[PDB]
Design a protein around this ligand. Structure first.
Ligand SMILES: *[C@@H]1O[C@H](CO)[C@@H](O[C@@H]2O[C@H](CO)[C@@H](O[C@@H]3O[C@H](CO)[C@@H](O)[C@H](O)[C@@H]3O)[C@H](O)[C@H]2NC(C)=O)[C@H](O)[C@H]1NC(C)=O
Ligand SMILES: *[C@@H]1O[C@H](CO)[C@@H](O[C@@H]2O[C@H](CO)[C@@H](O)[C@H](O)[C@H]2NC(C)=O)[C@H](O)[C@H]1NC(C)=O
Ligand code: CUO
Lengths: 211, 366, 182
């Protein structure tokens, strides 16, 4: 597996600078091989070449892999899960601060139990109207975002998959955004609250009466 | 504002104290430098007014000048720094210290050269807020200064009015206690900006335009005859950027109600809407005058200047948003318009015509 | 041009089969169109179909000065993209892009050059063009500072009328033809 270091393309054209190769490694295997998977990621240091190209270790770039079988046969990229860049900051480093205090309003997401009956009814109405009825700006579209009308990478064409991120470090980013969508959707339809949460961490006997 | 007696209390006496040192200056020498009595010489030794406005190194000179002044209350119970009043924040009236008629050191100054105390003649959302915020918007230092200087002198125009002995004039302004206090503020504004940059990773204690001029030393702060060691040390341009080694502190660099980070959000927020500006070329003229805009009212802005001042010309244009004017006429920056202006002298007359050339008119999205 | 205007040398077996709906006794009952169902009969519209066009000048240009424009157009070096087209199952829209390599390393691709359309529907009679369709890409290459000798290539990007639903390559790759000055 040859390691190519790529610099992303802005435009439609596939102009991604993958010219400069960052690394290289090898894999022993065979037929009637014992099935196996390292329980931990293999890390191949690319810091030096990343420094050579004059782009910060922090900044955006990616890594692609050329898998050549020992047979000499060039192999499909699908053979191996795509490489990732892992960044190790100078310890210790505090990431940038949050914005000071609060002003003048933020959507407040409460425990479902903390909801007054009024709040229950009002976000019930918001949900009721968002859901009923259907549109492009409606509930079913957002419900469709996550999974199975399969619009990924694009709703075209040949092979489509679910859009939601799973088995990745970016899972919670994706679903955070999604929850924000839901929030806007309910706010514009007339609810004073941010989307409430239910602690499943707290021991519970039954589902909240809300759902 | 927010002062607690006797915090107010200590100071008058200190200002009182230096009214006559009067040896070092004691205060009149300290006054002369911005003021009328002649600071320096061309090599021909001709009178100059050692005023360092109109140039890019404009803040340092002053920001110092506060220092010289600031030091001057030294161990005279100069227990806190010169206060600042945020003229940005709209105000129905002037601030006390400089108003109270009786037994107050801030009412006026005197002038051995003229035999008189200062006379001031005030003249009639907040205008300065809008004007300053723009300055903050900018990222180039030079770009910032032009607006920063012009936002500034708008007050030397309006505080003084039509008295030769006053804040409207270069000659005797420095004499009026009101002048420093206005400054602290002007200086404060500058500081805020530095914090801004710093936030943005742009240079703040440095500045890339123009390398020319920050290096020229500054008189009088240069002069041998300045018996304060400190200012001479930073008499230079490039020193005096980091006001930290002064050493003073502002209570808080927050524009009204805004974290610095908050502030950028604000400006960033403003920036969404596409704007339209007018920019003038301004250049030296002996007199000091105010200029009134038109297309409805678009005005206005003022220029500070006096006899025997070093001539100056700004490198860059001075911008003044006139979008509210267009909406007023319902124009789209598309329909095309005549930008009409007027330009009064501080003395009662007389709106002489440019002088300044023609205003360009430019559009910023968005 | 003194070249045949009411006859066609180019297609010979096709000019004598009467038009299939117009030759069908049902449901074409108009004797005019029925009688002239053959292509050859439809060549002269004026004598046969009894109509005229108000002016035959195009773009306000009389036919002599039109032919002049055409020939002066032939005057310069031009570059064309050739397309071998045939019947898709349905109608689709093809866009034309020009790929210019950067020095290091191997490189692509698109700046927008053109667009043309292909018509169709299910149950259409199958068809294959026996010659290239040409698309002048000369001026776009001029705007890229490119040449006929300069290194570059031409890619088509095909979008169905379904609504997006971009298609994989169904047509042979674009030819590049150079025509020297007249
Ligand atoms: C709009 O999108 C669909 C998405 O597939 C296009 O697919 C077309 O679908 C037809 C049948 O729905 C396909 O026909 C099939 O062809 C294969 C052989 O390739 C044959 O084994 C099947 O029995 C069937 O006949 C067709 O391949 C496919 N055509 C293309 C190029 O998309 C549909 O065509 C699109 N609609 C339009 C406007 O063309
Ligand atoms: C001439 O046209 C007629 C119809 O215009 C053809 O007869 C059929 O018409 C029915 C009407 O519903 C259609 O369902 C059939 O499909 C038509 N013909 C078929 C079955 O092909 C008639 O066939 C045509 N004659 C010729 C030889 O073209
Ligand atoms: O499923 Cu993807 O979100 Cu819990």
């Amino acid at each position: 597996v040859r390691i190519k270091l790529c610099i992303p393309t802005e435009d439609k054209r596939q102009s991604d600078n993958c010219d400069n190769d960052a690394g290289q490694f090898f894999i022993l295997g065979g037929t009637n091989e014992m099935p196996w998977n390292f329980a931990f990621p293999y890390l191949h240091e690319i810091t030096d070449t990343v420094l050579s190209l004059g782009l910060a270790l922090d900044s955006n770039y990616y890594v692609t892999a050329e898998v050549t079988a020992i047979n000499g046969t060039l192999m499909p990229t699908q053979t191996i899960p795509r490489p990732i860049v892992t960044y190790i900051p100078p310890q210790g480093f505090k990431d940038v601060n949050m914005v000071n205090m609060d002003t003048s309003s933020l959507r407040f997401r409460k425990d479902i139990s903390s909801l007054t009956t009024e709040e229950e009814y009002e976000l019930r109405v918001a949900m009721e109207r968002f859901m009923s009825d259907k549109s492009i700006n409606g509930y079913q579209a957002l419900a469709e975002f996550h999974g199975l009308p399969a619009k990924c990478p694009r709703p075209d064409a040949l092979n489509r998959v679910a859009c939601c991120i799973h088995g990745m470090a970016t899972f919670p980013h994706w679903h955070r955004l999604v929850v924000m969508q839901f929030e806007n959707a309910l706010f514009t339809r007339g609810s004073p609250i941010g989307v409430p949460y239910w602690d499943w961490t707290k021991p519970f006997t039954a589902l909240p009466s809300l759902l | 504002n927010s002062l607690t007696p006797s915090e107010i209390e200590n100071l008058r006496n200190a200002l009182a104290a230096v009214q006559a040192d009067k040896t070092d200056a004691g205060y009149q020498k300290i006054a002369s430098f911005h003021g009328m009595p002649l600071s320096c010489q061309y090599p021909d030794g001709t009178a100059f007014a050692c005023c360092q406005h109109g140039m890019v190194t404009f803040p340092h000179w002053h920001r110092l000048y506060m220092k010289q002044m600031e030091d001057a209350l030294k161990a005279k119970g100069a227990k806190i720094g010169i206060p600042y009043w945020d003229w940005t924040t709209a105000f129905h009236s002037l601030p006390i210290l400089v108003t109270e008629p009786k037994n107050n050191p801030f009412h006026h100054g005197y002038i051995d050269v003229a035999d008189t105390k200062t006379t001031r003649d005030p003249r009639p959302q907040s205008f300065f807020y809008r004007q300053i915020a723009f300055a903050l918007e900018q990222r180039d230092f030079c770009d910032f200064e032009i607006q920063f200087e012009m936002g500034h002198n708008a007050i030397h125009s309006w505080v003084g009015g039509p008295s030769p002995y006053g804040m409207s004039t270069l000659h005797y302004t420095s004499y009026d206690p009101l002048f420093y206090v206005h400054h602290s503020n002007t200086d404060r504004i500058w500081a805020i900006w530095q914090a801004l940059q710093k936030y943005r990773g742009l240079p703040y204690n440095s500045a890339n335009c123009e390398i020319n001029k920050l290096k020229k030393p500054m008189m009088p702060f240069s002069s041998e005859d300045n018996p304060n060691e400190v200012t001479k040390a930073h008499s230079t341009g490039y020193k005096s950027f980091d006001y930290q080694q002064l050493n003073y502190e502002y209570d808080n660099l927050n524009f009204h109600g805004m974290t610095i980070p908050q502030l950028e959000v604000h400006l960033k927020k403003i920036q969404e809407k596409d704007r339209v500006f007018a920019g003038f070329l301004l250049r030296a003229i002996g007199q000091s005058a105010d200029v009134n805009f038109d297309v409805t009212f678009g005005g206005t802005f003022c220029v500070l200047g006096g006899d025997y001042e070093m001539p100056w010309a700004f490198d860059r244009l001075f911008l003044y948003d006139i979008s509210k004017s267009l909406v007023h006429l319902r124009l789209d920056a598309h329909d095309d318009f005549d930008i009409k202006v007027t330009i009064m002298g501080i003395d009662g007359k007389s709106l002489p015509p440019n002088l300044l050339p023609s205003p360009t008119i430019l559009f910023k999205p968005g | 041009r003194k070249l045949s205007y009411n006859e066609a040398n180019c297609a010979l077996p096709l000019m004598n089969q009467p038009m299939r709906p117009f030759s069908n006794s049902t449901a074409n009952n108009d004797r005019l169109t029925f009688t002239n169902s053959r292509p050859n009969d439809v060549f002269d519209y004026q004598n046969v179909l009894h109509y005229k066009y108000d002016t035959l000048n195009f773009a306000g240009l009389s036919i002599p000065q039109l032919e002049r424009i055409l020939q002066k157009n032939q005057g310069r070096d031009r570059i064309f993209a050739g397309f071998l087209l045939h019947g898709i199952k349905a109608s689709a829209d093809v866009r034309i892009y020009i790929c210019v390599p950067t020095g290091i390393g191997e490189e692509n691709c698109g700046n927008y050059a053109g667009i043309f359309s292909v018509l169709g529907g299910e149950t259409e009679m199958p068809w294959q063009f026996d010659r290239l369709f040409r698309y002048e890409i000369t001026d776009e290459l001029k705007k890229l500072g490119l040449n006929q000798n300069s290194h570059f290539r031409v890619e088509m990007e095909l979008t169905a009328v379904n609504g997006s639903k971009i298609t994989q390559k169904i047509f042979p790759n674009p030819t590049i033809i150079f025509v020297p000055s007249d």
